[PDB]
Design an enzyme around this catalytic site. Sequence first.
Site, PDB file in Angstrom:
ATOM      1  N   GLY A  31       0.846  -1.184   0.000  1.00 14.37           N
ATOM      2  CA  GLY A  31       0.000   0.000   0.000  1.00 14.37           C
ATOM      3  C   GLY A  31       0.882   1.233   0.000  1.00 14.37           C
ATOM      4  O   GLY A  31       2.105   1.109  -0.007  1.00 14.37           O
ATOM      5  N   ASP A 144      -5.065  12.098  11.886  1.00 10.05           N
ATOM      6  CA  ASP A 144      -5.362  11.416  10.624  1.00 10.05           C
ATOM      7  C   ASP A 144      -6.071  10.060  10.831  1.00 10.05           C
ATOM      8  O   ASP A 144      -5.681   9.046  10.242  1.00 10.05           O
ATOM      9  CB  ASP A 144      -4.114  11.317   9.724  1.00 10.05           C
ATOM     10  CG  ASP A 144      -4.408  11.194   8.230  1.00 10.05           C
ATOM     11  OD1 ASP A 144      -5.582  11.452   7.819  1.00 10.05           O
ATOM     12  OD2 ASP A 144      -3.465  10.872   7.467  1.00 10.05           O
ATOM     13  N   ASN A 149      -5.763   4.011   7.897  1.00 11.83           N
ATOM     14  CA  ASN A 149      -4.831   4.058   9.038  1.00 11.83           C
ATOM     15  C   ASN A 149      -5.166   3.084  10.160  1.00 11.83           C
ATOM     16  O   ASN A 149      -4.592   3.183  11.249  1.00 11.83           O
ATOM     17  CB  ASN A 149      -4.663   5.500   9.564  1.00 11.83           C
ATOM     18  CG  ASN A 149      -3.819   6.324   8.640  1.00 11.83           C
ATOM     19  OD1 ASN A 149      -3.135   5.803   7.743  1.00 11.83           O
ATOM     20  ND2 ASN A 149      -3.880   7.629   8.791  1.00 11.83           N
TER      21      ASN A 149
HETATM   22  C1  LIG Z   1      -1.281  -6.878   3.367  1.00 14.62           C
HETATM   23  C2  LIG Z   1      -0.842  -5.559   3.925  1.00 14.62           C
HETATM   24  C3  LIG Z   1      -0.031  -5.336   5.075  1.00 14.62           C
HETATM   25  C4  LIG Z   1       0.033  -3.926   5.181  1.00 14.62           C
HETATM   26  N1  LIG Z   1       0.628  -3.171   6.138  1.00 14.62           N
HETATM   27  C5  LIG Z   1       1.346  -3.582   7.202  1.00 14.62           C
HETATM   28  O1  LIG Z   1       1.664  -4.761   7.486  1.00 14.62           O
HETATM   29  C6  LIG Z   1       1.770  -2.520   8.163  1.00 14.62           C
HETATM   30  C7  LIG Z   1       2.300  -2.733   9.479  1.00 14.62           C
HETATM   31  N2  LIG Z   1       2.565  -1.588  10.093  1.00 14.62           N
HETATM   32  N3  LIG Z   1       2.214  -0.595   9.176  1.00 14.62           N
HETATM   33  C8  LIG Z   1       2.310   0.754   9.360  1.00 14.62           C
HETATM   34  C9  LIG Z   1       1.866   1.580   8.338  1.00 14.62           C
HETATM   35  C10 LIG Z   1       1.327   0.960   7.158  1.00 14.62           C
HETATM   36  N4  LIG Z   1       1.244  -0.389   6.950  1.00 14.62           N
HETATM   37  C11 LIG Z   1       1.695  -1.170   7.976  1.00 14.62           C
HETATM   38  N5  LIG Z   1      -0.698  -3.369   4.150  1.00 14.62           N
HETATM   39  C12 LIG Z   1      -0.966  -2.021   3.865  1.00 14.62           C
HETATM   40  C13 LIG Z   1      -2.342  -1.581   3.779  1.00 14.62           C
HETATM   41  C14 LIG Z   1      -2.626  -0.206   3.499  1.00 14.62           C
HETATM   42  C15 LIG Z   1      -1.554   0.738   3.320  1.00 14.62           C
HETATM   43  C16 LIG Z   1      -0.188   0.302   3.409  1.00 14.62           C
HETATM   44  C17 LIG Z   1       0.112  -1.075   3.673  1.00 14.62           C
HETATM   45  N6  LIG Z   1      -1.232  -4.365   3.365  1.00 14.62           N
END
Ligand SMILES: Cc1cc(NC(=O)c2cnn3cccnc23)n(-c2ccccc2)n1
Length: 289
Positions: A31, A144, A149
């Site tokens: 993402g 936010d 988030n």
């Molecule tokens: C399968 C999967 C796993 C993750 N994201 C994460 O595992 C994740 C863990 N901490 N974190 C902190 C900020 C953003 N993402 C994360 N995403 C994801 C979803 C939306 C935006 C960015 C990453 N998709």
Amino acid sequence: TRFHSFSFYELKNVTNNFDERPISVGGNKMGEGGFGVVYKGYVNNTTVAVKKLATTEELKQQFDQEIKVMAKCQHENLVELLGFSSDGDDLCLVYVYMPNGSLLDRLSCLDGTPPLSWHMRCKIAQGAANGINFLHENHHIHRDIKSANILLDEAFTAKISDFGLARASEQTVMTSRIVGTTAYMAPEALRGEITPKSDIYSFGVVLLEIITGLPAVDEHREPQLLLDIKEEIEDEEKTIEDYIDKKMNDADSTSVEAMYSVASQCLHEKKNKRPDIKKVQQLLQEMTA
Ligand SMILES: Cc1cc(NC(=O)c2cnn3cccnc23)n(-c2ccccc2)n1
């Protein structure tokens, strides 16, 4: 709390040279949007989330603010920071992997994932409220709060993320740099005010997305902004039942109306008339119970 420092080159290596292709094609991009891109990686015998940030000074201020909030704030409903990287060109933030991605993506069934049941949604709403409560108890304002988030782990536990724009209290302050996501913002936040009452309003929008499965803003929709359904319901033009996500088989009218009542209270246009996070938390707990 102190974090493990990671080499930029180890993170570059494990994310296949920061591959911007989706997981579905063979890339690492999970993402983006949170002032950077989140890639899949494998460090110290674990699957990780590596956030590569992405003025350069403003982005570094967000990098330090995230670390500062994460060092102080450890809770089961907040994402867990493992480490960071500042040694290389780009700024990196390393987190515990959230296999279920975001609440936004799960509500929209992105990539063919099955719809979330009402039972899971109730747990996610409670978990997200427990995370906001922890932030407010510790005199932090997120700024936010949105479904993008709210991350979901191996058990669909809600984890609040993105503390780059977070502010300390531990009123009402004012700012010249108005930040956040328009579709989720309280009127006063859109005007420059900095208050935890703005997090409550944004959480009210999140509750509406959970009930309806609809995005906060949709160009090809009427109303375009989800928060406006509150008026349609109050003016008896429609009811919450007309808005309940049809991609559920386990939603009862009573608990849906109880969650909508919390959302409606959160969405009060006057900041001082909104319930605090502890009241939101109490009301969401009573809903199940
Ligand atoms: C399968 C999967 C796993 C993750 N994201 C994460 O595992 C994740 C863990 N901490 N974190 C902190 C900020 C953003 N993402 C994360 N995403 C994801 C979803 C939306 C935006 C960015 C990453 N998709």
